[PDB]
Protein backbone atom coordinates (compact mmCIF):
# COMPACT_ATOMS: atom_id res chain seq x y z
CA UNK A 1 0.00 0.00 0.00
CA UNK A 2 1.22 3.25 -1.17
CA UNK A 3 2.80 6.02 1.35
CA UNK A 4 4.59 9.22 1.53
CA UNK A 5 6.18 11.36 4.19
CA UNK A 6 5.55 15.46 4.86
CA UNK A 7 8.63 16.94 3.94
CA UNK A 8 10.56 13.78 4.14
CA UNK A 9 14.38 14.89 3.97
CA UNK A 10 13.62 18.56 5.76
CA UNK A 11 16.66 17.64 8.27
CA UNK A 12 19.37 17.46 5.36
CA UNK A 13 19.37 21.00 4.48
CA UNK A 14 20.87 22.13 7.38
CA UNK A 15 24.66 22.63 7.42
CA UNK A 16 27.96 23.36 9.93
CA UNK A 17 30.82 25.44 9.03
CA UNK A 18 33.53 23.43 6.44
CA UNK A 19 36.26 25.97 6.63
CA UNK A 20 39.58 24.69 6.21
CA UNK A 21 42.80 27.39 6.34
CA UNK A 22 44.56 24.15 4.11
CA UNK A 23 41.31 23.65 1.35
CA UNK A 24 40.99 27.00 1.09
CA UNK A 25 44.39 27.97 -0.23
CA UNK A 26 44.00 25.16 -2.59
CA UNK A 27 41.23 26.75 -3.85
CA UNK A 28 42.76 30.02 -4.15
CA UNK A 29 45.76 29.37 -5.23
CA UNK A 30 44.37 27.46 -8.46
CA UNK A 31 41.84 30.15 -9.38
CA UNK A 32 44.35 32.61 -11.93
CA UNK A 33 45.55 29.33 -13.87
CA UNK A 34 42.49 27.64 -14.25
CA UNK A 35 40.99 30.93 -15.70
CA UNK A 36 44.24 30.95 -17.90
CA UNK A 37 43.69 27.50 -19.27
CA UNK A 38 40.24 28.20 -20.03
CA UNK A 39 40.15 31.42 -21.75
CA UNK A 40 43.38 31.89 -23.15
CA UNK A 41 43.72 31.85 -26.85
CA UNK A 42 39.76 31.58 -26.71
CA UNK A 43 38.25 34.16 -29.84
CA UNK A 44 37.33 37.38 -28.11
CA UNK A 45 33.55 36.21 -28.95
CA UNK A 46 34.08 34.38 -25.81
CA UNK A 47 35.70 37.29 -23.65
CA UNK A 48 32.96 39.57 -24.57
CA UNK A 49 30.27 37.66 -24.02
CA UNK A 50 27.73 38.12 -20.83
CA UNK A 51 24.05 36.89 -19.48
CA UNK A 52 21.98 39.09 -21.37
CA UNK A 53 21.81 43.05 -21.01
CA UNK A 54 23.44 44.98 -18.92
CA UNK A 55 25.37 42.07 -17.16
CA UNK A 56 29.22 41.81 -17.10
CA UNK A 57 31.35 40.55 -19.81
CA UNK A 58 33.63 37.54 -19.22
CA UNK A 59 36.31 40.09 -19.58
CA UNK A 60 34.97 42.35 -17.00
CA UNK A 61 34.13 39.67 -14.33
CA UNK A 62 38.39 39.07 -14.38
CA UNK A 63 39.32 42.71 -14.56
CA UNK A 64 36.79 42.76 -11.59
CA UNK A 65 38.68 39.83 -9.87
CA UNK A 66 41.69 41.80 -10.27
CA UNK A 67 40.54 44.93 -8.58
CA UNK A 68 39.18 42.76 -5.59
CA UNK A 69 42.90 41.24 -5.22
CA UNK A 70 44.04 45.29 -4.95
CA UNK A 71 41.63 46.66 -2.66
CA UNK A 72 39.07 44.14 -1.15
CA UNK A 73 39.99 40.51 1.10
CA UNK A 74 43.54 41.51 2.18
CA UNK A 75 42.98 45.38 2.91
CA UNK A 76 40.03 43.99 5.39
CA UNK A 77 41.65 40.90 6.62
CA UNK A 78 44.55 43.66 8.13
CA UNK A 79 42.00 45.88 9.04
CA UNK A 80 40.44 43.40 11.21
CA UNK A 81 43.75 41.77 12.88
CA UNK A 82 44.61 45.71 12.65
CA UNK A 83 41.43 47.75 14.36
CA UNK A 84 39.57 44.86 15.64
CA UNK A 85 35.88 45.98 16.21
CA UNK A 86 36.97 49.47 17.20
CA UNK A 87 36.39 50.75 13.22
CA UNK A 88 34.40 49.49 10.67
CA UNK A 89 35.75 48.54 7.33
CA UNK A 90 36.15 51.40 4.94
CA UNK A 91 33.74 51.59 2.17
CA UNK A 92 35.64 50.88 -1.62
CA UNK A 93 36.98 53.57 -3.89
CA UNK A 94 36.71 56.92 -2.25
CA UNK A 95 40.48 49.64 -20.44
CA UNK A 96 38.51 47.20 -22.12
CA UNK A 97 41.52 47.63 -24.87
CA UNK A 98 44.72 45.63 -22.38
CA UNK A 99 44.53 41.94 -23.55
CA UNK A 100 42.81 39.26 -21.68
CA UNK A 101 46.32 37.81 -21.33
CA UNK A 102 47.86 40.72 -19.62
CA UNK A 103 44.78 40.95 -17.00
CA UNK A 104 45.96 36.82 -16.78
CA UNK A 105 49.37 37.90 -15.50
CA UNK A 106 48.20 40.38 -13.00
CA UNK A 107 45.63 38.35 -11.35
CA UNK A 108 48.10 35.59 -10.80
CA UNK A 109 50.58 37.97 -9.56
CA UNK A 110 48.52 39.79 -7.30
CA UNK A 111 46.83 35.91 -5.83
CA UNK A 112 50.67 34.69 -5.35
CA UNK A 113 51.78 38.02 -3.20
CA UNK A 114 48.30 37.91 -1.47
CA UNK A 115 48.33 34.55 -0.61
CA UNK A 116 51.84 35.24 0.65
CA UNK A 117 50.18 37.87 2.97
CA UNK A 118 47.78 35.73 4.13
CA UNK A 119 49.76 33.27 5.05
CA UNK A 120 51.89 35.98 7.63
CA UNK A 121 48.60 37.29 8.97
CA UNK A 122 47.31 34.36 10.13
CA UNK A 123 49.52 31.98 11.49
CA UNK A 124 47.12 29.53 13.43
CA UNK A 125 43.80 28.21 13.50
CA UNK A 126 42.86 30.13 16.33
CA UNK A 127 43.36 33.71 14.50
CA UNK A 128 40.45 32.44 12.72
CA UNK A 129 37.66 33.96 15.37
CA UNK A 130 39.24 36.99 15.24
CA UNK A 131 37.00 39.67 14.86
CA UNK A 132 36.25 43.09 13.02
CA UNK A 133 33.49 45.55 12.09
CA UNK A 134 31.67 45.48 8.52
CA UNK A 135 29.38 48.50 8.14
CA UNK A 136 26.60 46.96 7.51
CA UNK A 137 26.76 43.55 8.66
CA UNK A 138 28.26 44.00 12.18
CA UNK A 139 30.75 42.11 13.67
CA UNK A 140 32.60 39.51 11.23
CA UNK A 141 35.35 36.72 11.75
CA UNK A 142 38.23 35.95 9.68
CA UNK A 143 37.63 32.91 8.85
CA UNK A 144 33.82 34.41 7.52
CA UNK A 145 36.43 37.28 5.13
CA UNK A 146 38.44 34.28 3.94
CA UNK A 147 35.21 32.00 2.94
CA UNK A 148 33.31 35.06 1.52
CA UNK A 149 36.96 35.11 -0.26
CA UNK A 150 37.00 31.73 -1.49
CA UNK A 151 32.98 31.48 -2.66
CA UNK A 152 33.84 34.79 -4.64
CA UNK A 153 35.88 33.28 -7.10
CA UNK A 154 33.48 29.90 -7.75
CA UNK A 155 30.96 32.23 -7.56
CA UNK A 156 32.67 34.67 -10.55
CA UNK A 157 34.02 31.56 -12.26
CA UNK A 158 30.08 29.97 -12.87
CA UNK A 159 29.22 33.76 -14.09
CA UNK A 160 31.68 33.69 -16.57
CA UNK A 161 30.78 30.07 -17.41
CA UNK A 162 27.38 30.72 -17.60
CA UNK A 163 27.55 34.10 -19.81
CA UNK A 164 29.21 31.41 -22.44
CA UNK A 165 26.82 28.26 -22.11
CA UNK A 166 24.25 31.73 -23.08
CA UNK A 167 25.78 32.31 -25.99
CA UNK A 168 24.26 28.89 -27.43
CA UNK A 169 20.60 29.45 -26.33
CA UNK A 170 19.45 29.04 -29.31
CA UNK A 171 22.00 27.29 -31.33
CA UNK A 172 21.07 23.98 -28.94
CA UNK A 173 18.03 23.88 -30.26
CA UNK A 174 15.14 21.31 -28.49
CA UNK A 175 18.36 20.27 -26.27
CA UNK A 176 17.57 24.24 -23.98
CA UNK A 177 15.30 22.51 -21.38
CA UNK A 178 17.33 19.21 -20.49
CA UNK A 179 20.32 21.05 -20.15
CA UNK A 180 18.58 22.89 -17.26
CA UNK A 181 18.18 19.48 -15.91
CA UNK A 182 20.92 18.29 -13.71
CA UNK A 183 21.42 14.70 -11.84
CA UNK A 184 19.84 12.60 -14.13
CA UNK B 1 9.15 62.36 -16.48
CA UNK B 2 7.20 59.20 -17.83
CA UNK B 3 7.60 55.71 -17.61
CA UNK B 4 7.96 52.70 -21.04
CA UNK B 5 6.32 49.61 -20.84
CA UNK B 6 8.06 46.90 -21.31
CA UNK B 7 11.12 49.17 -21.97
CA UNK B 8 14.02 46.77 -23.55
CA UNK B 9 11.13 43.39 -24.77
CA UNK B 10 13.31 44.28 -28.39
CA UNK B 11 16.52 43.19 -26.76
CA UNK B 12 15.42 39.70 -25.90
CA UNK B 13 15.24 37.31 -28.99
CA UNK B 14 18.89 35.83 -29.55
CA UNK B 15 19.93 34.52 -33.15
CA UNK B 16 22.28 31.44 -33.84
CA UNK B 17 26.06 32.13 -32.74
CA UNK B 18 27.83 28.64 -33.09
CA UNK B 19 31.22 28.63 -35.16
CA UNK B 20 32.77 25.34 -35.70
CA UNK B 21 36.32 26.63 -34.81
CA UNK B 22 35.21 28.66 -32.02
CA UNK B 23 33.22 25.47 -30.39
CA UNK B 24 36.32 23.21 -31.32
CA UNK B 25 38.27 25.69 -29.18
CA UNK B 26 36.25 24.97 -25.85
CA UNK B 27 35.58 21.44 -26.46
CA UNK B 28 39.73 20.86 -26.22
CA UNK B 29 39.84 23.20 -23.25
CA UNK B 30 37.78 21.50 -21.20
CA UNK B 31 40.12 18.49 -19.65
CA UNK B 32 42.68 20.42 -19.03
CA UNK B 33 40.81 23.50 -17.48
CA UNK B 34 39.04 20.62 -15.02
CA UNK B 35 42.39 18.81 -14.36
CA UNK B 36 44.29 22.12 -13.54
CA UNK B 37 41.23 23.45 -10.92
CA UNK B 38 41.15 20.04 -9.65
CA UNK B 39 43.82 18.30 -9.35
CA UNK B 40 45.84 17.52 -6.08
CA UNK B 41 42.57 19.12 -3.98
CA UNK B 42 41.76 17.25 -0.72
CA UNK B 43 39.28 14.71 -1.57
CA UNK B 44 36.55 17.08 0.35
CA UNK B 45 36.64 19.21 -2.75
CA UNK B 46 35.95 16.22 -5.33
CA UNK B 47 33.17 14.69 -2.74
CA UNK B 48 30.99 18.00 -2.29
CA UNK B 49 27.95 18.25 -4.10
CA UNK B 50 24.73 20.35 -3.65
CA UNK B 51 22.51 18.75 -1.27
CA UNK B 52 21.02 15.31 -1.12
CA UNK B 53 20.45 13.05 -4.38
CA UNK B 54 22.78 15.50 -6.33
CA UNK B 55 25.97 14.10 -7.74
CA UNK B 56 30.07 14.69 -6.65
CA UNK B 57 32.41 16.78 -7.96
CA UNK B 58 34.06 13.30 -8.86
CA UNK B 59 30.37 11.87 -10.32
CA UNK B 60 30.09 14.75 -12.59
CA UNK B 61 33.44 14.27 -13.89
CA UNK B 62 32.80 10.55 -14.05
CA UNK B 63 29.52 11.77 -16.10
CA UNK B 64 31.76 13.89 -18.58
CA UNK B 65 33.97 10.58 -19.34
CA UNK B 66 30.26 8.64 -20.05
CA UNK B 67 29.36 11.10 -22.24
CA UNK B 68 32.32 11.05 -24.37
CA UNK B 69 32.12 7.15 -24.89
CA UNK B 70 28.02 7.42 -25.06
CA UNK B 71 26.56 10.82 -26.42
CA UNK B 72 27.74 13.30 -28.67
CA UNK B 73 29.99 11.35 -31.65
CA UNK B 74 27.98 8.19 -31.78
CA UNK B 75 24.83 10.62 -32.22
CA UNK B 76 26.92 12.30 -34.40
CA UNK B 77 27.45 9.24 -36.62
CA UNK B 78 23.87 8.13 -36.30
CA UNK B 79 23.14 11.48 -37.68
CA UNK B 80 25.26 11.54 -40.57
CA UNK B 81 24.99 7.89 -41.62
CA UNK B 82 20.84 7.40 -40.99
CA UNK B 83 19.59 11.10 -41.65
CA UNK B 84 15.72 11.68 -40.70
CA UNK B 85 14.61 8.50 -41.61
CA UNK B 86 15.64 6.64 -38.62
CA UNK B 87 15.66 8.50 -35.20
CA UNK B 88 18.88 8.18 -32.96
CA UNK B 89 18.37 5.63 -29.70
CA UNK B 90 17.21 7.25 -26.47
CA UNK B 91 19.53 6.31 -23.50
CA UNK B 92 16.95 4.95 -21.36
CA UNK B 93 17.42 1.32 -22.81
CA UNK B 94 20.97 0.94 -22.55
CA UNK B 95 22.14 0.06 -18.78
CA UNK B 96 26.05 1.26 -17.67
CA UNK B 97 27.41 -0.63 -14.68
CA UNK B 98 27.84 2.10 -11.61
CA UNK B 99 31.40 2.89 -11.18
CA UNK B 100 33.79 3.03 -8.38
CA UNK B 101 34.94 6.04 -6.35
CA UNK B 102 38.25 4.42 -5.06
CA UNK B 103 39.66 5.11 -8.87
CA UNK B 104 41.93 8.45 -8.08
CA UNK B 105 40.44 11.34 -9.91
CA UNK B 106 43.97 11.71 -11.59
CA UNK B 107 43.04 8.39 -13.36
CA UNK B 108 39.53 10.37 -14.81
CA UNK B 109 41.31 13.47 -16.02
CA UNK B 110 43.82 11.19 -17.98
CA UNK B 111 40.80 9.23 -19.48
CA UNK B 112 38.53 11.93 -19.98
CA UNK B 113 41.64 14.07 -21.97
CA UNK B 114 42.24 11.28 -24.06
CA UNK B 115 38.66 10.43 -24.96
CA UNK B 116 38.34 14.13 -25.93
CA UNK B 117 41.24 14.11 -28.08
CA UNK B 118 39.82 11.23 -29.67
CA UNK B 119 36.46 12.34 -30.60
CA UNK B 120 37.70 15.94 -31.33
CA UNK B 121 39.68 13.85 -34.44
CA UNK B 122 36.63 11.72 -34.97
CA UNK B 123 34.75 15.39 -35.35
CA UNK B 124 36.56 16.97 -37.85
CA UNK B 125 36.85 13.49 -40.09
CA UNK B 126 32.40 13.27 -40.23
CA UNK B 127 32.05 17.52 -39.89
CA UNK B 128 34.52 18.48 -42.74
CA UNK B 129 31.96 21.86 -44.11
CA UNK B 130 29.57 24.38 -43.06
CA UNK B 131 26.90 22.01 -45.55
CA UNK B 132 27.54 19.46 -42.88
CA UNK B 133 26.79 20.93 -39.98
CA UNK B 134 22.63 22.01 -41.74
CA UNK B 135 23.02 17.89 -41.76
CA UNK B 136 19.54 16.50 -40.21
CA UNK B 137 18.51 13.33 -38.22
CA UNK B 138 16.10 12.61 -36.06
CA UNK B 139 15.75 12.72 -31.59
CA UNK B 140 13.49 9.99 -30.76
CA UNK B 141 11.41 12.39 -28.48
CA UNK B 142 12.17 16.38 -30.14
CA UNK B 143 12.14 15.83 -34.01
CA UNK B 144 14.36 16.74 -36.57
CA UNK B 145 17.74 17.88 -35.01
CA UNK B 146 20.45 19.41 -36.98
CA UNK B 147 24.37 18.60 -36.21
CA UNK B 148 25.15 22.12 -35.43
CA UNK B 149 22.39 21.68 -32.80
CA UNK B 150 24.10 18.09 -31.43
CA UNK B 151 27.87 20.18 -31.19
CA UNK B 152 26.37 23.20 -29.58
CA UNK B 153 24.44 20.74 -26.75
CA UNK B 154 27.85 18.97 -26.65
CA UNK B 155 29.52 22.82 -25.77
CA UNK B 156 27.06 23.69 -23.42
CA UNK B 157 27.06 20.10 -21.63
CA UNK B 158 30.67 20.83 -20.63
CA UNK B 159 29.90 24.32 -19.22
CA UNK B 160 27.01 23.45 -17.56
CA UNK B 161 28.79 20.43 -15.84
CA UNK B 162 31.80 22.95 -15.02
CA UNK B 163 28.94 25.58 -13.12
CA UNK B 164 27.98 22.61 -11.40
CA UNK B 165 31.21 21.47 -10.11
CA UNK B 166 31.91 25.49 -9.35
CA UNK B 167 28.36 25.43 -7.31
CA UNK B 168 29.22 22.42 -5.67
CA UNK B 169 32.36 23.48 -3.88
CA UNK B 170 30.72 27.43 -2.74
CA UNK B 171 28.14 25.67 -1.42
CA UNK B 172 30.27 23.72 1.01
CA UNK B 173 30.71 27.51 2.56
CA UNK B 174 26.88 28.13 3.00
CA UNK B 175 27.44 28.60 6.59
CA UNK B 176 30.82 29.90 6.68
CA UNK B 177 30.53 32.91 4.96
CA UNK B 178 27.99 34.24 7.76
CA UNK B 179 26.49 37.66 6.19
CA UNK B 180 28.20 37.12 3.08
CA UNK B 181 25.82 34.79 2.27
CA UNK B 182 22.84 37.04 0.85
CA UNK B 183 25.14 39.53 -1.38
CA UNK B 184 27.02 36.48 -3.05
CA UNK B 185 24.07 35.94 -4.75
CA UNK B 186 23.93 39.42 -5.94
CA UNK B 187 25.95 39.84 -8.83
CA UNK B 188 26.83 42.72 -11.77
CA UNK B 189 27.28 45.27 -8.83
NI1 LIG C 1 32.20 40.21 -6.96
NI1 LIG D 1 24.95 15.60 -18.40
Redesign the pocket.
Known amino acids: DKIHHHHHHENLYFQGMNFQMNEAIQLLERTPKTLEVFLEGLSDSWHQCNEGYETWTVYEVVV?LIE?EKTNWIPRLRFILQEGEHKPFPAFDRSNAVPISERFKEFQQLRKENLNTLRSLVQSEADLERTGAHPAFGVVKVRELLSAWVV?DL??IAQIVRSMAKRYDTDVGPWKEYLGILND
Open positions: HAHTH
